[PDB]
From a paper:
V1 is a part of an ion pump V-[name], which transports cations across the membrane by ATP-hydrolysis-driven rotation. V1 comprises a rotor composed of the D and F subunits, and a stator, a hexameric ring, composed of three A subunits and three B subunits. However, the details of their sequences and structures are different, resulting in two different interfaces between the A and B subunits in the A3B3 hexameric ring: a catalytic interface, at which the A subunit has an ATP-hydrolysis catalytic site; and a non-catalytic interface, at which the B subunit has a pseudo-active site, which has evolutionally lost the ATP-hydrolysis or even binding ability. We used computational design to restore the lost ATP-binding ability of the pseudo-active site in the B subunit of a rotary molecular motor, V1-[name].
The designed B subunit (De), expressed together with the A subunit in Escherichia coli and purified by Ni2+-affinity chromatography followed by gel-filtration chromatography, was found to form a ring complex with the A subunit (A3(De)3 ring complex). Therefore, we determined the crystal structures of the A3(De)3 complex to prove the nucleotide-binding ability of De. First, the A3(De)3 complex was crystallized in the absence of nucleotide and the structure was solved at 2.8 Å resolution; this was named A3(De)3_empty. The De structure in A3(De)3_empty was almost identical to the computational model not only in terms of the overall structure but also in terms of the designed site together with the P-loop features. ADP molecules are shown as spheres. c,d, Superposition of the computational design model of the designed B subunit (white) and the solved crystal structure in the absence of nucleotides (pink) (chain D of A3(De)3_empty was used because this had the highest resolution data of the three designed B subunits): comparison for the entire backbone (the Cα r.m.s.d. calculated by MICAN33 is 1.48 Å) (c); comparison for the designed binding site (d). The backbone geometry of the designed P-loop was almost identical to that of the design model. e, The interface between chains C and D in A3(De)3_(ADP·Pi)1cat(ADP)2cat,2non-cat.
Author numbering:
A (entry chain D): 3 to 434
B (entry chain E): 2 to 450
C (entry chain A): 1 to 586
Amino acid sequence: KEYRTIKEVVGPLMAVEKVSGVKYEELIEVRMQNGEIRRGQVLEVQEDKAMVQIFEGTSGINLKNSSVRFLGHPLQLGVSEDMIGRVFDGLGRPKDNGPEILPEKYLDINGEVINPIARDYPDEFIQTGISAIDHLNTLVRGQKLPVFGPPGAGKSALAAQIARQATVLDSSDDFAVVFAAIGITFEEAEFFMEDFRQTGAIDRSVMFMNLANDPAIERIATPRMALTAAEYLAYEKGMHVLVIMEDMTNYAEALREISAARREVPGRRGYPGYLYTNLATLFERAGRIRGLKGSVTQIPILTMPEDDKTHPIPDLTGYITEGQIILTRELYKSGISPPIDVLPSLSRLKDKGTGAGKTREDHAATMNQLFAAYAQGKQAKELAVVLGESALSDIDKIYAKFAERFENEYVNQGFYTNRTITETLDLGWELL
Amino acid sequence: IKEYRTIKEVVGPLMAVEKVSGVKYEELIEVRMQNGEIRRGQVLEVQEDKAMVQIFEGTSGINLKNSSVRFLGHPLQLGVSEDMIGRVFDGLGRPKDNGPEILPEKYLDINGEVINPIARDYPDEFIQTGISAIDHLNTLVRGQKLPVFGPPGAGKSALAAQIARQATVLDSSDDFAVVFAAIGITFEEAEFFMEDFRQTGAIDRSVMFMNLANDPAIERIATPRMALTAAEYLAYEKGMHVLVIMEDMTNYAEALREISAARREVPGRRGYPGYLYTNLATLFERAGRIRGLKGSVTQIPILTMPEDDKTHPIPDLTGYITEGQIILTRELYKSGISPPIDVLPSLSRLKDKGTGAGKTREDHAATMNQLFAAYAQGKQAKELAVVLGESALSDIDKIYAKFAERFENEYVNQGFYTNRTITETLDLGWELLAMLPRTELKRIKDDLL
Amino acid sequence: MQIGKIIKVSGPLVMAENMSEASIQDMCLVGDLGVIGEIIEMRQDVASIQVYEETSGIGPGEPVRSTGEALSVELGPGIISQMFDGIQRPLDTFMEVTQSNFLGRGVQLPALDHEKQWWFEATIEEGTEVSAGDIIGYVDETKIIQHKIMVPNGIKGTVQKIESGSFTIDDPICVIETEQGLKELTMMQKWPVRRGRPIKQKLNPDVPMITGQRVIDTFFPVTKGGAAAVPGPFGAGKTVVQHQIAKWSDVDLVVYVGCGERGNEMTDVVNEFPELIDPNTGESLMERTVLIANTSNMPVAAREASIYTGITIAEYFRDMGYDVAIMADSTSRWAEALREMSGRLEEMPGDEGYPAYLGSRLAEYYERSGRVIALGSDQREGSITAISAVSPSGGDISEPVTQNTLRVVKVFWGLDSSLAQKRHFPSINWIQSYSLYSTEVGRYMDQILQQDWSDMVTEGMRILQEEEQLNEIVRLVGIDSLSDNDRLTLEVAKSIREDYLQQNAFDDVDTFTSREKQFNMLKVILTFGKEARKALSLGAYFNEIMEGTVAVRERISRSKYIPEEELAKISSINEEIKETIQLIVS
């Protein structure tokens, strides 16, 4: 039943009267007086009145001669195995002009919370082919390992590279990739999409593309769309799914904007104050489930502040994540691709992902003292800029040169070279 | 007996009662809960036939329909009697020892009265704290307020207990009482204070108001006022000199923040109530003497020094109000230094009215100034003596540092149970400038005698 | 009985009319789904409820039922060895009853098994006058722990009917003649978790707890009824220290509380803790442990109520005469939950966004631990000892959670990553750690050992603190520039560090060191120091002392591994120490 009872429009918000049976977070359709149809969501419901928000805004609407239909369900994803190779927008609607998907079922994109005793501990090793990660900051299935970087420092290039050369060692059980673009530009999106098509990786990928000029309210739905598809492929088809989301900083900003538009109570830095709730509800959606085959692994991509806080505070993210992968600008100016500063980078779960029966057995030991060559390699030369010519030169003579090699060849793989882990270890020993 | 069954509304710790009359601002209330439980509260606002109250113990479990509010017809008051001496109470003056409830002389508004400016008399007599670093250099005067600033756990509580143990008025026909206010301290710290009071019998000249860390915050706010109302009663109506020790006033500021946020009252300038200073003045101004009366009220607030952090009860903020400082450091306390009072930043602006003949020997001032100066630079000598090395040690500068090291180890480290009378500390101060030849002595007139 | 009706749903806030029979802070089942919520406000008959689960799909017109009680725990046989969430939802039962790996909205399951038969053994006679705390009988609930059945608070009178037998916790096992008539008692009582369970008297915790971990028992001990704070940085072996305390402490029950932790971390806990073996019996520790587990994405009220649920259970077992250790990890996460709940309620922030009552809340929780005389005519003693993890985002003790904790607890065990690098475990910083119980514990240790152990401890600590200063002299000038006494101090300090402080939790013998073994080990260390000092002043050189002492010094370093039955082999070291050095002075 359409309701012809719109009484108030203030900004993107609408007040509808004399409804009954309307539920919180229920989706609506506005049928405008000119025949246009917009999609929306119930944000408050009170006696016989409902307050909704229109995804496309309210510009052009005439209240008296428009109507609202209450669809009787929230934001859902139509899921199917056929989502592999396809490209959608932030709401799961096709962006690739391709054949239509007949969903197996529709799933609430908010998800369920895993019972803690049903969860399984992260175990297997993922070969990103990036030596700087695979060796020092090893990625395990079920982990949440974010990467932080300044703008245009190739962090997105790194993202597409991990998406490219990510695999498991048995590789009997397929590795699917779910990619979520969160409020990025058309050109960034095209980088990801056309790369995915040229390397063929699209054949094992599902893409959710929300652009910098899409409605912020849809930007809020995008990561949950990605993760619902990911959990469906993992726990209902037995797949091992890797989830990449850039840029989560944009997700933080869209949250701030929506909360402002809804005259809510501002928390820290005007950010909604439920950033921990929201980001944790997103990031804790990774892992393994005892008794099921698949897995979900997340790699969020964040813009690092490099300024007066006023960013999606990492401490929040790092408080929920199991590690940090840091890119700095000074490695990008040197031409180092990928520019990972191994020193503040951490993998909270590298331990039981790497070991005997999982990787070559030098791996650990060389890691646990390969940091040390870089630790005292730049402890001399970078610190002693003033005293550089002679202070600590006769002794510790080579500890600079080997650090230069660590940057120049060990970590400067190139954004298009796939280093097998054992190959990486060979380079690691030759550098020593 | 005014009691209504008309609770309309409960939001957090606040309640609205309607269809009332004769209810006054800040009047005390009791909530009679449907389950027999009884909670205390205060009228925060009153308008037409409505009254907004706040419940000290909160509103958890209250059923509005079946509960009632009794309006007691008076504010927070303390029933006073000289029989408070020797007893132990909670923050609201209720007996905490298993003795009897007292029959009050009268009930006093714990906010107190505002002294007429021409009726106040200046502080002018001496008090024996027994801690020489105080009694000598930073003398405490009857009627003064001298705070103690300190680091966490660094014998600060031991100093509180020591002053309360060893406090009296010399050569005086008048009585000396102590009122002790614990503000939001733990059970173990309170047990320390209570039975230390009874091992030394100090309890017998003492009144104790014990507020614990898990008591309601309003009771923290009320505790020092209860203490001071008792103290003023004893002083200005029983003629005694009363020393009032309030341990962890920093906890008091945190309780003020909590109350303000619960009341959505003051947008906190620092999250902190804007009136933290003003409230504190309301307490600190309750010390002094009244001309025409032989009593006296003297205050020693004890605070946790901000651990080099900005958001705290700032010392300088207190510093306008207070009439000095007594600062303790752990850098000295880890050296076994106890009581660890760093004598350089300590100050007692009212010392002259206490450092007087007839209460002290005449050497007091001059002693103090050369002990101070010669330690003052003896330190600098020793600091430079290690940073410049044992090789770069001058003679005059080998002897300046000696005084400093010995001053710490023996002039300040007297121990927490040694009551050094003023006569001692004068002699004992000279005993160590006995190394200092006659050559740098502030006076020369009666260095002999 | 009374069904209220939803009139407003807005995010987590739900307003329901026709609720006048409910009370503030009552728990409610909200909507057709029956999701759990709490009454926070009441205006005439209209209640405002903060809903714990997702409110999506809920709207006006639906029902609301009050449970008639505040957030509570069920206490009775069947609680030991269970894994709960922060509001005592049974996680194992949830999986089988719902046939799902997820916590779905609005499923309602009792915390304990109400169908299970237990053997109640009656131990009180009919006609007896009883009040709260009195033990009427018991149940052998696990292979380790005897569940004592007590008269609930609020019940007083004469035992009229009582017989042993096989009952569920729902069956009336006792009848008591009260001023209000006959009241039936079952084996289960309920208690509201934000209220401390009443006691007869609070006592000073002055009896040392034997953890068997040498650094703690000796230099930073905790008493039964005390509380300790543990910084838990990454890669510092916190989990192994925690297991060590849990299985080796001379307590009766362990209550572990995971407050809103990362899913994978919490999976570690739920997997490893059951594999822990109880030393005395060889059974799993779960036969005397209650575990609460919450992840970051669980309802905030579960994560905020985690510690209160845990400590209410702990108080319940303390009232039985038992000693309990409640371990909370992490209280920083619990404080995150507090902060979020404060933000939802539109409250005015305090320091760093935390509510103004953060300190007060922490104080209520920690003042609920301690040693007590419990209720009951026998006046038995119980204690709760608290071990609380803090984990700041930057890892700092100036941040509000840690500063407020250290305001009210007396023990601090500073775990250190640099110590874990050097393979020094447990990585407890001996310079920054402290225990304000150490004086009182020294008194106790002296009276119990009939040795002068307090002085030995003070001297060992003087040696370690002196080593820290001599190490900087070694930094600025060379090692060769030290006195033979100074060099000896460094060597005896190395012996304290490597032969005493360093403990392998995985070695069968090093994993636990008794009180007596600890005494003999430390006096071996210190007597080497002492006799070598004497021989130094007697003309011998430190190099002659060292080169001539290799073998007995290796017997010193190996003493940690001597079996507890062969303790003389440690004490005899003293003789060998005195003899060799005596022939070194010729």
